[PDB]
Amino acid sequence: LRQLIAQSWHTDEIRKLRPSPVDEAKWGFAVVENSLWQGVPNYLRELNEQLEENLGYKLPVEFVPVRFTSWMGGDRDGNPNVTADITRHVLLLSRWKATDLFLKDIQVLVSELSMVEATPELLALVGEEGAAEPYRYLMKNLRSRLMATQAWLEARLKGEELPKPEGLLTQNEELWE
Amino acid sequence: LRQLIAQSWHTDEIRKLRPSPVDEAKWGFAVVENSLWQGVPNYLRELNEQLEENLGYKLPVEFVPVRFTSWMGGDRDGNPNVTADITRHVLLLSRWKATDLFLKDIQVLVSELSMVEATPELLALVGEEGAAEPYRYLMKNLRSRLMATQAWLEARLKGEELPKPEGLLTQNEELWEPLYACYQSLQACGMGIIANGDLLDTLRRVKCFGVPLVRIDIRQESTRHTEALGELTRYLGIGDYESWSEADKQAFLIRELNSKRPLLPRNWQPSAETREVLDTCQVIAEAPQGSIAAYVISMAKTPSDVLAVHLLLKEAGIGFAMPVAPLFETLDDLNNANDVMTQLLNIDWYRGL
Amino acid sequence: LRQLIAQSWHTDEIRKLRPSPVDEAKWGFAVVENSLWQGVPNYLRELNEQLEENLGYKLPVEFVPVRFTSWMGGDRDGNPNVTADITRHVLLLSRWKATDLFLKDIQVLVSELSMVEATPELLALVGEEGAAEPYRYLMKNLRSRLMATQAWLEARLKGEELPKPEGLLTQNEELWEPLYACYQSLQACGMGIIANGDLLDTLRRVKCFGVPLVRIDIRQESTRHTEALGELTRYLGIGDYESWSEADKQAFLIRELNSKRPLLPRNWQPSAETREVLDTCQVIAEAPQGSIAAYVISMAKTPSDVLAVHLLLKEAGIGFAMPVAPLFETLDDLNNANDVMTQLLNIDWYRGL
Numbered sequence: 020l021r022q023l024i025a026q027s028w029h030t031d032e033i034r035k036l037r038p039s040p041v042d043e044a045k046w047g048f049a050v051v052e053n054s055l056w057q058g059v060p061n062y063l064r065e066l067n068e069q070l071e072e073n074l075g076y077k078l079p080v081e082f083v084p085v086r087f088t089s090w091m092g093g094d095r096d097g098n099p100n101v102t103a104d105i106t107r108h109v110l111l112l113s114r115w116k117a118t119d120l121f122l123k124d125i126q127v128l129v130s131e132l133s134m135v136e137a138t139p140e141l142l143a144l145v146g147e148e149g150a151a152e153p154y155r156y157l158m159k160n161l162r163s164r165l166m167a168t169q170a171w172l173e174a175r176l177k178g179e180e181l182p183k184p185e186g187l188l189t190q191n192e193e194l195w196e
Numbered sequence: 197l198r199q200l201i202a203q204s205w206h207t208d209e210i211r212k213l214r215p216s217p218v219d220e221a222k223w224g225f226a227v228v229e230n231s232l233w234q235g236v237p238n239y240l241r242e243l244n245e246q247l248e249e250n251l252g253y254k255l256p257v258e259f260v261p262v263r264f265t266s267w268m269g270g271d272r273d274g275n276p277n278v279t280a281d282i283t284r285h286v287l288l289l290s291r292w293k294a295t296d297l298f299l300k301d302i303q304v305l306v307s308e309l310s311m312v313e314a315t316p317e318l319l320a321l322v323g324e325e326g327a328a329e330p331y332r333y334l335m336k337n338l339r340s341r342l343m344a345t346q347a348w349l350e351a352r353l354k355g356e357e358l359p360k361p362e363g364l365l366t367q368n369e370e371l372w373e374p375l376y377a378c379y380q381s382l383q384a385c386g387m388g389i390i391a392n393g394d395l396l397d398t399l400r401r402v403k404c405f406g407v408p409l410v411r412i413d414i415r416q417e418s419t420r421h422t423e424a425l426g427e428l429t430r431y432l433g434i435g436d437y438e439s440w441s442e443a444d445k446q447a448f449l450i451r452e453l454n455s456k457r458p459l460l461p462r463n464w465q466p467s468a469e470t471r472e473v474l475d476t477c478q479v480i481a482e483a484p485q486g487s488i489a490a491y492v493i494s495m496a497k498t499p500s501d502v503l504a505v506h507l508l509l510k511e512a513g514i515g516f517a518m519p520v521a522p523l524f525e526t527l528d529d530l531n532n533a534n535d536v537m538t539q540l541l542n543i544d545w546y547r548g549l
Numbered sequence: 550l551r552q553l554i555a556q557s558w559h560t561d562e563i564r565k566l567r568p569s570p571v572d573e574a575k576w577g578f579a580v581v582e583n584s585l586w587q588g589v590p591n592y593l594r595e596l597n598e599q600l601e602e603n604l605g606y607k608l609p610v611e612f613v614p615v616r617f618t619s620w621m622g623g624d625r626d627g628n629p630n631v632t633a634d635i636t637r638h639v640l641l642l643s644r645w646k647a648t649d650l651f652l653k654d655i656q657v658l659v660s661e662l663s664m665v666e667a668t669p670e671l672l673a674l675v676g677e678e679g680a681a682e683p684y685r686y687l688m689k690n691l692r693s694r695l696m697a698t699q700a701w702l703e704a705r706l707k708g709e710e711l712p713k714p715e716g717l718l719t720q721n722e723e724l725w726e727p728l729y730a731c732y733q734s735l736q737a738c739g740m741g742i743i744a745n746g747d748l749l750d751t752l753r754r755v756k757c758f759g760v761p762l763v764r765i766d767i768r769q770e771s772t773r774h775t776e777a778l779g780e781l782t783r784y785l786g787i788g789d790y791e792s793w794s795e796a797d798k799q800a801f802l803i804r805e806l807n808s809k810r811p812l813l814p815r816n817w818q819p820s821a822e823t824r825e826v827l828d829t830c831q832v833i834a835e836a837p838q839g840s841i842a843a844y845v846i847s848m849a850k851t852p853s854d855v856l857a858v859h860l861l862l863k864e865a866g867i868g869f870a871m872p873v874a875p876l877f878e879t880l881d882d883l884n885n886a887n888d889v890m891t892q893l894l895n896i897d898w899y900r901g902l
C-alpha cells in the first residue's frame with residue numbers, strides 16, 4: 020500500500036498537449052481490459068445463476084445481451100481533429116487490441132483443453148491429424164489465425180500495405196464457430 | 197474450486213515415453229517461475245526487516261546470499277541421454293527463459309519509472325536524448341538489449357547460426373549496472389520507497405538468478421575420465437594411463453598441466469564414450485563464464501581423479517578457474533577422503549590453482 | 550576507329566595510389582576473359598585438327614594439357630601487403646569470377662541443347678521429370694547450382710557468414726560430370742557436330758580453368774619459416790630452432806612430422822610476422838583442394854628449408870599432399886641444388902610423402 024501510494028505522489032505525468040482521438044480511443048481500451056473483460060462474463064454468470072434459482076431456467080449459451088460501443092475516434096461532431104484518417108486508424112487499433120486480448124484467452128484454452136473424448140461431429144471437424152488432441156487442435160488453429168491477423172494489423176498500423184493472410188479475422192463468426 | 201478440481205480429473209496427461217533431459221530441465225524452469233521468482237525477493241525482504249528490527253542494521257543492497265543451480269541437463273553420471281549436445285541446448289534454453297522473465301520485470305519498470313529528478317552521475321550516464329525521462333531511458337535500453345538476445349537465442353535454439361547482436365547479454369553485470377544506477381539516484385533524489393520496491397526485487401533476482409537463470413553443474417564418473425585419458429595416451433604412443441600406478445598418473449598429469457604444448461590431437465577419431473567426455477568439456481569451455489557452477493566427479497577415489505578433469509578442461513581451452521569437486525560416496529572413499537585431500541593440497545601447483 | 554582512339558586520348562585514368570594485390574588479381578581475370586577464355590579452346594581445336602591430319606589420331610576429349618595459374622594474391626615474397634586475409638579474399642573472388650564466366654557458357658547451352666534423342670544411361674541420369682528435354686535438364690540443374698554458389702560467394706566477399714547452399718560448387722568434377730554426360734549421348738545418338746562445338750569448348754575450359762578459375766601459388770621466403778618455427782620452439786621451451794645446426798633441424802623436423810601430438814599452441818600470442826606465416830597455411834588448409842597449385846620457397850638453401858613448410862602445413866591441418874618447391878636463386882644455391890635434393894630424396898619419409 021505505501022509503495023502504491025508513493026508511486027502516485029511521484030509518478031507525475033501531466034499532458035502538456037491536448038490529447039488526440041487515438042489517446043482517448045486508448046483509454047477506452049484500458050477500461051475494456053482492466054474491468055469489462057472480467058466484468059461482463061461475471062455479470063452473465065450471476066444473472067444466469069439467478070434466473071435458474073428464482074425462475075427455473077438459464078438463458079441459452081448463444082444469448083449474450085450486452086454489447087459495448089465507443090464514440091472515441093467516431094464522434095466528429097464539432098471536432099475537426101477526428102478525421103476520416105483517424106477513424107480508419109482507430110478502427111484498426113481496436114482490431115489489434117482484440118487480437119491481443121483474445122490471444123490471452125486462447126493460450127489458456129490451448130493448454131487446458133487436453134480432453135480427448137469428443138463427438139462424431141467434432142472429430143469429423145478435425146478428422147485425423149489432430150484427432151488425437153481434438154479440442155486443442157481447434158484452439159491451436161485459432162491461435163495462428165489470430166496471430167496472423169495481429170501481424171497484418173501491426174503492419175497496417177505502421178503504414179505498410181501488404182496483402183492479407185489467408186486466415187485474416189474479420190467477423191465474430193470466425194471466433195464463435 | 198469445482199472448476200479447478202474438475203480440470204485435474206479430466207485433464208489427464210501420462211507420459212507414454214521416457215522424459216528427456218530437456219523436459220526435466222523445463223520442470224525446473226516451472227519451479228523457478230511459479231515460486232522462486234517471487235519467493236526469493238520476499239525471503240530477502242523479511243530477512244532484512246528482521247535484521248534491522250532485532251539487530252539494528254540491514255544488509256547492503258549488493259548482498260544477495262542465495263543462488264539456485266540445477267543438475268538438469270548437467271548430470272550425466274550414469275545417463276547416456278545427457279549428451280554434450282543436450283547440455284549445450286539446455287544452457288541456451290535457460291538463457292532464453294531468463295530473457296522471458298526479465299522482460300516481464302523490465303516492462304513494469306519502463307512504465308513505473310516516470311521520475312524526472314535524477315543525479316549528476318545518472319544524468320551524465322544518459323546525457324541528453326533521454327535526459328527528459330532518465331530512469332525510463334535506461335530501462336528502455338535494457339528492454340531492447342534483452343529483446344535482442346532473446347531473438348538470438350530463439351534462432352540458436354532452432355539450429356540456425358547467425359552472428360550475435362551488439363547488445364547480446366552474457367553476464368549479470370550487464371543487467372546489474374543500469375538497474376543499480378536507477379536505484380542510486382532514486383535514493384539520492386528522495387525516492388527511496390520506489391527504489392526499494394520492484395527495482396529491489398529485480399536487483400536481487402539478477403544476482404540470484406541472472407543471465408543463465410539457474411547455473412547448471414556438470415557431473416561425470418571418474419572412471420569415464422580415466423578411459424578418455426587412457427585412449428588418448430595410447431593413441432599418442434606415450435603409454436597407457438589406466439595401467440600406471442597413481443604416482444605415475446600424478447606425474448604425467450602435473451607435467452601436462454604445466455606444459456605449453458597441446459596434447460589433444462587436432463583431428464582425432466576417438467570412441468563414442470571418449471568423444472562425449474571431450475565434447476562436454478568443450479561445451480563448458482564454450483559457455484559464458486558463470487553458466488556452469490562446478491564440475492562434480494562422482495566416484496572420486498584418488499588425487500589423480502581430480503587432476504584428471506583439470507587436465508581435460510585445460511585441453512578444452514578454458515579461461516577461468518572451474519571449481520572441481522570430488523564426490524566421495526563409499527565407506528572407504530569417505531574413510532580415505534581426508535588422505536586424498538591432504539595429498540592434493542600438498543601439491544604446490546594444485547594449491548595455487 | 551576515330552571513336553576508339555579518341556576514347557584513349559580522353560579516357561585518362563592514372564593510379565594515384567599503389568595498386569593492391571586485389572587489383573592485380575583483377576587484371577589477371579581481365580586477361581583470362583578477354584583472351585584466354587577463347588584462346589585456349591581454339592588452341593586445342595587447331596592442335597587436334599593437326600594431330601589427326603599429320604599423325605592419324607585425335608587426343609581424347611578428357612585430355613586437356615593446358616592449365617593457367619596466377620601468383621597474384623599468392624606471392625608474398627618481399628610483400629607485406631599480401632596478407633593471409635588478402636589471399637583468402639582473392640581465392641573467393643576467383644571463384645566468383647568463374648561462376649560469372651561459366652554462367653555465360655551454361656546459358657548458351659541451356660538454349661541450344663533442345664535435342665530429345667538420348668541414351669539409356671543419360672535418360673536414367675534424369676529419369677522422368679526432365680526426360681522430355683534431357684540435355685536441357687542437366688544444363689538447367691547446373692545453372693542453378695552455379696547461381697547458388699555465385700550468391701554465396703558474393704555474400705562472403707561482402708563479409709557475411711551464412712551456411713553454404715546444398716549445390717555449392719567446389720570441385721571441377723561437379724562441372725565436368727554433367728557436361729561430359731551430354732557430350733557422350735550426343736555422340737552416341739548421332740549429334741557429333743553439336744557435341745564437338747560449344748560443349749567441347751566448355752568441357753576444355755572446366756579442366757583448363759575450372760572452379761577456381763586460375764589456381765594460385767603461395768610464395769614466402771625460407772627465412773620467414775625459420776623465424777616462425779624459431780619463435781614457436783622458444784615458446785614451448787624446447788630450444789631455439791634458428792641456432793641448431795642443419796642436422797638437428799632435420800632431426801627435429803622429422804620427429805615432429807611423424808608425431809601424432811600437435812605442436813602449435815591452441816591460443817598463442819606470436820608476433821605479427823609469425824602469425825602471418827601461420828595464418829597463410831591456415832588459408833591453404835582451409836581452401837578447397839585444387840585452388841592452390843604449389844607452395845614455393847624463395848631462397849631455399851638446405852633440406853630443412855623444404856621440411857620446414859611440410860611441418861607448418863601439417864600443423865595447419867591439411868588433408869592432401871601439397872607440392873612444395875625450393876626456389877634456388879643464387880649461384881651457390883644453384884651449385885648446391887643437386888646436393889640439397891639428393892639428401893632430401895635419401896630421407897625415406899620425404900620420398901614417400
Ligand SMILES: [Mn+2]
Pocket residue numbers: 494495525
Ligand atoms: Mn554414485
Ligand SMILES: [Mn+2]
Pocket residue numbers: 847848878
Ligand atoms: Mn629472390
